[PDB]
Amino acid sequence: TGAGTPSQGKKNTTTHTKCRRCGEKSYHTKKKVCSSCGFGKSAKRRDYEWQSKAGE
């Protein structure tokens, strides 16, 4: 079975969903953790210095 088109047919699983805390469609309903704002993982908001250039 090809890893391409033929394997795309089984993708009918819902994982990332609208997040209660940030509004982005990143709340993983299986993990119950938002990949965008960290909701479900930390009280503090997910953020990293690498999200922008070092001198900015």
Partner RNA sequence: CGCACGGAGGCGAAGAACCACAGAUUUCCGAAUGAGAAUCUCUAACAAUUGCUUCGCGCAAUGAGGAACCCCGAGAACUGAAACAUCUCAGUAUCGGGAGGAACAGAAAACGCAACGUGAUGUCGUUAGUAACCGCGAGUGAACGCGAUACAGCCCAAAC
Partner RNA sequence: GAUACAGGGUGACAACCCCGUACUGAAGACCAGUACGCUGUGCGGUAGUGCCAGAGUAGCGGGGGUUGGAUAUCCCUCGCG
Partner RNA sequence: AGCUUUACUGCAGGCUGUCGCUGAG
CB of residue 14 to RNA, shortest distance in Å: 5
Burial degree of 52 (CB within 10 A; 0-12, 13-18, 19+): exposed
Site for RNA in 10-39 (CB under 7 A): 14, 17-21, 23, 27, 29, 32, 39
* 47 contacts Sr ion (rule: CB under 5 A): yes
Q: How far is the CB of 10 from Sr ion (least distance, A)?
A: 4
**Both ends of the chain: CA-CA distance in Å?**
47
Q: What is the CA radius of gyration of the chain?
A: 16
Binding residues for Zn(2+): 19, 22, 34, 37
